[PDB]
Amino acid sequence: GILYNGRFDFSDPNGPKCAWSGSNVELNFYGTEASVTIKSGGENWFQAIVDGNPLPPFSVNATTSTVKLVSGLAEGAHHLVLWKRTEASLGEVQFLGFDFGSGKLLAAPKPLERKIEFIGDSITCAYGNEGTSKEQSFTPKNENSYMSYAAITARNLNASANMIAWSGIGLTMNYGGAPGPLIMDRYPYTLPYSGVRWDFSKYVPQVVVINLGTNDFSTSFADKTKFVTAYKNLISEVRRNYPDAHIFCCVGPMLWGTGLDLCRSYVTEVVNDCNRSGDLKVYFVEFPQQDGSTGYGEDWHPSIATHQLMAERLTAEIKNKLGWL
Ligand SMILES: OC[C@H]1O[C@@H](O[C@H]2[C@H](O)[C@@H](O)[C@H](O[C@H]3[C@H](O)[C@@H](O)[C@H](O[C@H]4[C@H](O)[C@@H](O)[C@H](O[C@H]5[C@H](O)[C@@H](O)[C@H](O)O[C@@H]5CO)O[C@@H]4CO)O[C@@H]3CO)O[C@@H]2CO)[C@H](O)[C@@H](O)[C@@H]1O
């Protein structure tokens, strides 16, 4: 009856729980209106997309609330997507039930056959993408993962996407060397704060996109051996979960100067080594450095325009390798 698109935990009979950016619930209903009850651990933001039209977003902040998603529609069958805009670090969310007024739930859409997993950091979270000032610091309201390069690429390809991304995370270090779990430590989890492990058999993508290393080179440059080994470890893990996946290793568009040259050198070394070792389904993609001609979001993170450029590039790369025309 309902599609739960993402890494969801179903252990609580009161309602499915999720954390990662871009987690979304998708359903068909008959009627004129729809409501949902949401519990949120922090300041999470959502958007309802109803018959293909995105509605003004709303937050549910460290509380449980019943929210009217849409109303006053022509009575009939409608398609609804409820999208978690904000990232896992802003808290787990539990969906406690829908209400359709005098209407009803209808058969759910067929799940998409094409599947992508994205693994990344602030760029894939779409940190700050609805801010237009690079001087402004992070606000949850301005983080719109629906307009991340990852979400846009998935819609371009008629694919579902799981967005396994955490702002500031790296392969060898987090932003500014702040201590914390690194990507390989969070990657195994459905709910990374509470230790609920993800069962990798539940979602086997044909494509994995990795965009990591910005935090490894934006302040103090990571050690080459350490970084290359860490990146290889991650690819090994992805390959062990998904023997048949095409893996796209991506650099850009936030790195600049020497940090960008070193990151490019190290990641292309990783890809070339995987290829020589016999894995021909590991590829490299570079998003050209943002130069200001497409503006900036909060803390210099990519604008929606820059996300759109990335999505055009990445869509064409995946179409090429997969034949996903
Ligand atoms: O609060 C939520 C979340 O925060 C995480 O930490 C955030 C941190 O709070 C931010 O301050 C930080 O922002 C920095 C970016 O990561 C970093 O990439 C960016 O670096 C700039 C650089 O400052 C700037 O000089 C550079 O300019 C270049 C131009 O882009 C080029 O065109 C030109 O040729 O060259 C110049 C430089 O010569 O641009 C780059 C980016 O392109 O600076 C930001 C700070 O100013 O981001 C962190 C990670 O998201 C924290 O980790 C979380 O735990 C926390 O929840």
PDB file of C-alpha atoms and ligand atoms in Angstrom, residues 87 89-90 121-123 127 134-139 143 166-169 174-176 178-179 186 193 214-215 218-219 253-257 289-292 296 298-302, ligand 1:
ATOM      1  CA  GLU A  87      20.217  14.979   6.664  1.00  0.00           C
ATOM      2  CA  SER A  89      22.529  14.327  11.657  1.00  0.00           C
ATOM      3  CA  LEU A  90      19.352  16.430  12.207  1.00  0.00           C
ATOM      4  CA  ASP A 121      29.284  14.312   2.471  1.00  0.00           C
ATOM      5  CA  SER A 122      27.779  17.833   2.600  1.00  0.00           C
ATOM      6  CA  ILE A 123      27.651  18.115  -1.187  1.00  0.00           C
ATOM      7  CA  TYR A 127      23.940  21.460   2.594  1.00  0.00           C
ATOM      8  CA  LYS A 134      28.394  32.003   0.920  1.00  0.00           C
ATOM      9  CA  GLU A 135      28.790  34.036   4.151  1.00  0.00           C
ATOM     10  CA  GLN A 136      25.748  32.448   5.787  1.00  0.00           C
ATOM     11  CA  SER A 137      26.261  29.399   7.983  1.00  0.00           C
ATOM     12  CA  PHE A 138      24.239  26.178   7.904  1.00  0.00           C
ATOM     13  CA  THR A 139      20.485  26.349   8.466  1.00  0.00           C
ATOM     14  CA  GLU A 143      19.176  22.114   2.949  1.00  0.00           C
ATOM     15  CA  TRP A 166      26.724  13.060   6.294  1.00  0.00           C
ATOM     16  CA  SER A 167      27.816  16.716   6.279  1.00  0.00           C
ATOM     17  CA  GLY A 168      31.551  17.194   7.011  1.00  0.00           C
ATOM     18  CA  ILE A 169      32.420  13.464   6.861  1.00  0.00           C
ATOM     19  CA  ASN A 174      36.067  15.024   9.178  1.00  0.00           C
ATOM     20  CA  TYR A 175      35.927  18.750   8.358  1.00  0.00           C
ATOM     21  CA  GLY A 176      38.709  20.704  10.198  1.00  0.00           C
ATOM     22  CA  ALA A 178      36.948  17.362  14.313  1.00  0.00           C
ATOM     23  CA  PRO A 179      36.842  13.897  15.870  1.00  0.00           C
ATOM     24  CA  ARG A 186      28.346   5.237   9.394  1.00  0.00           C
ATOM     25  CA  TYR A 193      22.802   7.504  15.819  1.00  0.00           C
ATOM     26  CA  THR A 214      36.392  17.241   0.198  1.00  0.00           C
ATOM     27  CA  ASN A 215      36.805  17.075   3.968  1.00  0.00           C
ATOM     28  CA  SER A 218      39.767  21.308   2.580  1.00  0.00           C
ATOM     29  CA  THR A 219      41.869  22.161   5.659  1.00  0.00           C
ATOM     30  CA  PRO A 253      33.058  20.843  -7.232  1.00  0.00           C
ATOM     31  CA  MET A 254      34.169  22.393  -3.857  1.00  0.00           C
ATOM     32  CA  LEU A 255      37.904  21.558  -3.758  1.00  0.00           C
ATOM     33  CA  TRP A 256      40.349  24.163  -5.149  1.00  0.00           C
ATOM     34  CA  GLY A 257      44.101  24.685  -5.587  1.00  0.00           C
ATOM     35  CA  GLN A 289      35.308  23.381  -9.744  1.00  0.00           C
ATOM     36  CA  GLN A 290      32.563  25.939  -9.023  1.00  0.00           C
ATOM     37  CA  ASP A 291      33.891  29.345 -10.060  1.00  0.00           C
ATOM     38  CA  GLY A 292      31.115  31.671  -8.816  1.00  0.00           C
ATOM     39  CA  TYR A 296      27.002  29.704  -3.990  1.00  0.00           C
ATOM     40  CA  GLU A 298      25.643  28.445   2.621  1.00  0.00           C
ATOM     41  CA  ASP A 299      29.299  28.144   3.574  1.00  0.00           C
ATOM     42  CA  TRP A 300      30.302  28.058  -0.171  1.00  0.00           C
ATOM     43  CA  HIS A 301      28.414  24.788  -0.733  1.00  0.00           C
ATOM     44  CA  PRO A 302      26.904  24.274  -4.218  1.00  0.00           C
TER      45      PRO A 302
HETATM   46  O1  LIG B   1      26.783  23.023  10.925  1.00  0.00           O
HETATM   47  C1  LIG B   1      26.428  21.880  10.194  1.00  0.00           C
HETATM   48  C2  LIG B   1      27.653  20.972   9.987  1.00  0.00           C
HETATM   49  O2  LIG B   1      28.840  21.731   9.825  1.00  0.00           O
HETATM   50  C3  LIG B   1      29.931  20.964   9.354  1.00  0.00           C
HETATM   51  O3  LIG B   1      31.027  21.829   9.073  1.00  0.00           O
HETATM   52  C4  LIG B   1      30.867  22.640   8.019  1.00  0.00           C
HETATM   53  C5  LIG B   1      31.401  23.963   8.581  1.00  0.00           C
HETATM   54  O4  LIG B   1      30.501  24.470   9.574  1.00  0.00           O
HETATM   55  C6  LIG B   1      31.542  24.978   7.456  1.00  0.00           C
HETATM   56  O5  LIG B   1      32.079  26.195   7.983  1.00  0.00           O
HETATM   57  C7  LIG B   1      32.397  24.393   6.336  1.00  0.00           C
HETATM   58  O6  LIG B   1      32.504  25.293   5.240  1.00  0.00           O
HETATM   59  C8  LIG B   1      33.644  25.299   4.543  1.00  0.00           C
HETATM   60  C9  LIG B   1      33.666  24.336   3.368  1.00  0.00           C
HETATM   61  O7  LIG B   1      33.675  23.002   3.823  1.00  0.00           O
HETATM   62  C10 LIG B   1      34.891  24.578   2.489  1.00  0.00           C
HETATM   63  O8  LIG B   1      34.846  23.762   1.321  1.00  0.00           O
HETATM   64  C11 LIG B   1      34.960  26.064   2.085  1.00  0.00           C
HETATM   65  O9  LIG B   1      36.182  26.298   1.419  1.00  0.00           O
HETATM   66  C12 LIG B   1      36.147  27.176   0.405  1.00  0.00           C
HETATM   67  C13 LIG B   1      37.206  28.212   0.810  1.00  0.00           C
HETATM   68  O10 LIG B   1      36.891  28.810   2.050  1.00  0.00           O
HETATM   69  C14 LIG B   1      37.310  29.329  -0.221  1.00  0.00           C
HETATM   70  O11 LIG B   1      38.479  30.047   0.034  1.00  0.00           O
HETATM   71  C15 LIG B   1      37.418  28.686  -1.599  1.00  0.00           C
HETATM   72  O12 LIG B   1      37.562  29.671  -2.598  1.00  0.00           O
HETATM   73  C16 LIG B   1      37.967  29.408  -3.473  1.00  0.00           C
HETATM   74  C17 LIG B   1      36.996  29.483  -4.645  1.00  0.00           C
HETATM   75  O13 LIG B   1      36.013  28.482  -4.505  1.00  0.00           O
HETATM   76  C18 LIG B   1      37.723  29.298  -5.972  1.00  0.00           C
HETATM   77  O14 LIG B   1      36.855  29.621  -7.034  1.00  0.00           O
HETATM   78  C19 LIG B   1      38.963  30.183  -6.042  1.00  0.00           C
HETATM   79  O15 LIG B   1      39.663  29.915  -7.236  1.00  0.00           O
HETATM   80  O16 LIG B   1      39.797  29.913  -4.938  1.00  0.00           O
HETATM   81  C20 LIG B   1      39.190  30.285  -3.720  1.00  0.00           C
HETATM   82  C21 LIG B   1      40.199  30.146  -2.587  1.00  0.00           C
HETATM   83  O17 LIG B   1      41.471  30.552  -3.038  1.00  0.00           O
HETATM   84  O18 LIG B   1      36.251  27.971  -1.877  1.00  0.00           O
HETATM   85  C22 LIG B   1      36.175  26.796  -1.086  1.00  0.00           C
HETATM   86  C23 LIG B   1      34.940  26.007  -1.502  1.00  0.00           C
HETATM   87  O19 LIG B   1      34.755  25.942  -2.922  1.00  0.00           O
HETATM   88  O20 LIG B   1      34.898  26.945   3.191  1.00  0.00           O
HETATM   89  C24 LIG B   1      33.777  26.749   4.063  1.00  0.00           C
HETATM   90  C25 LIG B   1      34.004  27.625   5.297  1.00  0.00           C
HETATM   91  O21 LIG B   1      34.161  28.898   4.767  1.00  0.00           O
HETATM   92  O22 LIG B   1      31.823  23.186   5.872  1.00  0.00           O
HETATM   93  C26 LIG B   1      31.794  22.173   6.875  1.00  0.00           C
HETATM   94  C27 LIG B   1      31.436  20.804   6.262  1.00  0.00           C
HETATM   95  O23 LIG B   1      30.127  20.873   5.726  1.00  0.00           O
HETATM   96  C28 LIG B   1      30.327  19.918  10.391  1.00  0.00           C
HETATM   97  O24 LIG B   1      31.330  19.052   9.876  1.00  0.00           O
HETATM   98  C29 LIG B   1      29.080  19.141  10.833  1.00  0.00           C
HETATM   99  O25 LIG B   1      29.397  18.239  11.874  1.00  0.00           O
HETATM  100  C30 LIG B   1      27.934  20.090  11.188  1.00  0.00           C
HETATM  101  O26 LIG B   1      26.765  19.341  11.451  1.00  0.00           O
END
